[PDB]
Design an enzyme around this catalytic site. Structure first.
Site, PDB file in Angstrom:
ATOM      1  N   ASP A 261       0.882  -1.165   0.000  1.00  0.00           N
ATOM      2  CA  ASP A 261       0.000   0.000   0.000  1.00  0.00           C
ATOM      3  C   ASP A 261       0.921   1.216   0.000  1.00  0.00           C
ATOM      4  O   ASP A 261       1.643   1.449   0.951  1.00  0.00           O
ATOM      5  CB  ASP A 261      -0.891  -0.048   1.244  1.00  0.00           C
ATOM      6  CG  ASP A 261      -1.536   1.291   1.591  1.00  0.00           C
ATOM      7  OD1 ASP A 261      -1.701   2.190   0.736  1.00  0.00           O
ATOM      8  OD2 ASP A 261      -1.896   1.421   2.767  1.00  0.00           O
TER       9      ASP A 261
ATOM     10  N   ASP B 170      -1.694  -1.021   6.459  1.00  0.00           N
ATOM     11  CA  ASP B 170      -1.657  -0.368   7.735  1.00  0.00           C
ATOM     12  C   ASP B 170      -2.975  -0.120   8.419  1.00  0.00           C
ATOM     13  O   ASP B 170      -2.989   0.116   9.607  1.00  0.00           O
ATOM     14  CB  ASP B 170      -0.893   0.956   7.599  1.00  0.00           C
ATOM     15  CG  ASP B 170      -1.647   1.973   6.775  1.00  0.00           C
ATOM     16  OD1 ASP B 170      -2.410   1.560   5.896  1.00  0.00           O
ATOM     17  OD2 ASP B 170      -1.482   3.189   6.986  1.00  0.00           O
TER      18      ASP B 170
END
Ligand SMILES: [Ca+2]
Ligand SMILES: [Ca+2]
Ligand SMILES: [Ca+2]
Ligand SMILES: [Ca+2]
Ligand SMILES: [Ca+2]
Ligand SMILES: [Ca+2]
Lengths: 225, 225
Positions: free
Chosen positions: A9, A175
């Site tokens: 990401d 995350d």
């Protein structure tokens, strides 16, 4: 299973407090790629933006924008898997009676619609969005109005098929909640020290670092660098 | 693409007003199967229970119990994808300080844990569960303590590989929230007239019927009968 591919990401894991790209992370990626690892970047930003990261950072795998709805290939072509005709229309309408607004980068979007909105109008727009088969969430620079199923799980499953891999040959780095779609897959998982509790709970490795410094330690842990 | 396999969630789709199996649904499945359709059933029941459905109902494809965590294969074998050691342990500990209690059918569970609990204790327990990589929700006959990612999407992806199909050759039928995962995949989607508002919005075909009567209508719509 030895890790062959890592899906990362961009906004959640490769940047610092000021959203700038982390140079240690870039060096960790390059070092790991030199040793055989295939890297794929995923972001909510537009394809020309992630394309720029691919060529300048030196990503050897495909990259995705619009949260997995559009991808730039290894053969230099662009393929999208969802259309923005509906999401764009939803924005046009909602902006007539809410704070929901278009953003600059929408001019380069093809498979979804990004937007800014006052916190007070979020609950209402989300209900209207879902009643339309869309979903909304925030990531990176804005909110994103997407087609149901147009997410990171889609992108990682696509990578698995493109590279004929087993889930356990894939490592995902994220995350937060907008990364859960790919963390709930049977892939290998790693996250930073500031990742949400739920992401840490299902991760195979929780780093002592964040803001880009978790990449180097993650790769070292899985013996990828 | 022509539909080659239908993945069907039992509860709310194959059951009638009394949560009883619909005879019209049974005949519709057998008819479609005679015409070439592969049908797979999925539910939260334990494996011997969905096995009972497979042999008495006449299901020609795999069947899944425990929300996708265990399967009874085409070769008469049972394959488990997750373990219940950790979830059983959790229920044991929690039962000493909350109203959470084991249920009779856990005597046949192998990949997750079923339970009963007072509504007010739900929040306390969900928090503790998610910190361990599990999730909880209610469906069918009880609450379910699952491993993260142990769901119907995991099952449908498995069927995809097993039958070497493309997502567009797969039709999913569901109606409640715990069915949404199948609807987030790039497959063909359908639901009964009384499915949630969110499911309806992402379905390709929404039936005029419920309580089993939608199966016939849905199959006809896709030239399956
Ligand atoms: Ca994220
Ligand atoms: Ca972050
Ligand atoms: Ca962004
Ligand atoms: Ca694993
Ligand atoms: Ca029920
Ligand atoms: Ca259901």
């Amino acid at each position: 299973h030895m890790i062959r591919l890592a899906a990362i990401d961009v906004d959640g894991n490769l940047t610092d407090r000021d959203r700038l790209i982390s140079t240690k992370a870039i060096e960790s990626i390059r070092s790991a790629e030199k040793k055989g690892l295939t890297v794929s970047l995923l972001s909510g930003n537009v394809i020309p933006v992630v394309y720029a990261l691919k060529i300048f950072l030196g990503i050897n795998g495909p990259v995705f924008g619009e949260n997995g709805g559009i991808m730039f290939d290894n053969d230099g072509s662009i393929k999208k898997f969802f259309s923005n005709e509906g999401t764009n229309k939803f924005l046009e309408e909602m902006s007539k009676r809410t704070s929901m607004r278009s953003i600059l980068t929408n001019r380069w979007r093809e498979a979804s619609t990004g937007f800014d909105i006052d916190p007070e109008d979020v609950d209402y727009v989300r209900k209207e969005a879902e009643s339309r088969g869309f979903v909304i969430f925030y990531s990176g620079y804005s909110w994103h109005l997407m087609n149901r199923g147009e997410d990171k799980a889609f992108a990682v499953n696509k990578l698995k098929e493109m590279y004929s891999l087993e889930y356990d040959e894939i490592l995902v780095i994220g995350d937060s909640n907008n990364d859960m779609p790919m963390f709930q897959l049977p892939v290998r998982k790693a996250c930073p020290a500031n990742a949400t509790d739920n992401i840490k709970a299902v991760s195979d490795f929780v780093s002592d670092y964040s803001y880009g410094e978790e990449i180097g330690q993650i790769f070292k842990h899985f013996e990828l660098m």
